[PDB]
């Protein structure tokens, strides 16, 4: 199948027509997405099969074909870009200054951008085009507005 680096849609034909259930990142021959998009199931790329390699429900992340490769981090000061890939629509960059999720275990960047659920797994990038995390695991605040964590894994 296609192994070129880039952003990909994750689709299924199990429901009505072809449905986009999420998005992910191919980098260094490894496919990266959020666990809730695939639930750890195998994927197809053309006639090739991608098998899960690593995953964690609490981080809400999963990698296919190899270990998690994305290790860039938000600098805590600069604007970033969400490369949103909404269902049925072209990939589009949206620039924003992240907010912060403060937790008992430390602080995480967060982006206050609201897209359809099938956009989950879309990458968030720094100015060098490095992926600093994936969009789609977050919360609904007072206003009813959605805010996603910038969710990043660990490169072993």
């Amino acid at each position: 199948g296609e192994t070129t680096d880039g952003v990909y849609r994750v689709m299924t034909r199990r429901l009505l027509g072809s449905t986009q259930v999420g998005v992910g990142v191919m980098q260094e021959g490894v496919f990266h997405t959020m666990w809730h998009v695939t639930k750890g199931a195998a994927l197809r790329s053309g006639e090739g099969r991608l098998d899960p390699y690593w995953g964690d429900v609490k981080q809400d992340l999963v990698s296919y074909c190899g270990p998690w490769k994305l290790d860039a981090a938000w600098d805590g000061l600069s604007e970033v870009q969400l490369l949103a890939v909404p269902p049925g629509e072209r990939a589009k960059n949206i620039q924003t200054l992240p907010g912060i999720f403060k937790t008992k275990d430390g602080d995480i960047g967060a982006v206050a951008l609201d897209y359809p659920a099938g956009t989950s797994g879309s990458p968030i990038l720094d100015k060098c085009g490095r992926v600093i995390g994936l969009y789609g695991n977050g919360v609904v605040i007072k206003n009813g507005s959605y805010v996603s964590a910038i969710t990043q894994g660990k490169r072993e």
Binding site: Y8, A42, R44, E79, Q81, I94, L113, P123, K127
Partner: peptide, 20 residues
């Protein structure tokens, strides 16, 4: 059965729309 389809390069876009 889930399958993947390429949607783009991962790059920073100069003068992208800014919001949030």
């Amino acid at each position: 059965d889930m399958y993947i389809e390429r949607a783009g390069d991962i790059t920073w876009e100069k003068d992208a729309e800014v919001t949030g």
